[PDB]
Design a protein around this ligand. Structure first.
Ligand SMILES: [Cl-]
Ligand SMILES: [Cl-]
Ligand SMILES: [Cl-]
Ligand SMILES: [Zn+2]
Length: 96
């Protein structure tokens, strides 16, 4: 298997979450070498915190947002990069 640009094979799902609950976005990327992943909320890069966690387990990418409020609604985007190229996916959160 030659090195290749990241390709997203399972895309995030736009969804709703009741105020105060935790939620996750999950996608799957195929990348060789392994992709560097960045996450964004309405265009602004997310950093890990008590509220935000993200992981990459062999290409399964998960963003977890804890204790969701109205301010957490909006567009979440993952960007996956290696020297061969990039892939990106986005979805919406609606906190109800
Ligand atoms: Cl896969
Ligand atoms: Cl990867
Ligand atoms: Cl965006
Ligand atoms: Zn709360």
């Amino acid at each position: 298997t030659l090195d290749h640009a990241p390709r997203i094979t399972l895309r995030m799902r736009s969804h709703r979450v009741p105020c105060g609950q935790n939620t996750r976005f999950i996608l799957n990327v195929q990348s060789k070498p392994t992709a560097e992943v960045k996450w964004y909320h309405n265009g602004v890069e997310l950093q890990e915190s008590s509220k935000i966690h993200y992981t990459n387990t062999s290409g399964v990418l998960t963003l977890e947002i804890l204790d969701c409020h109205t301010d957490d609604s909006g567009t979440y985007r993952a960007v996956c990069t290696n020297y061969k190229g990039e892939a990106s996916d986005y979805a919406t959160l609606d906190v109800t």
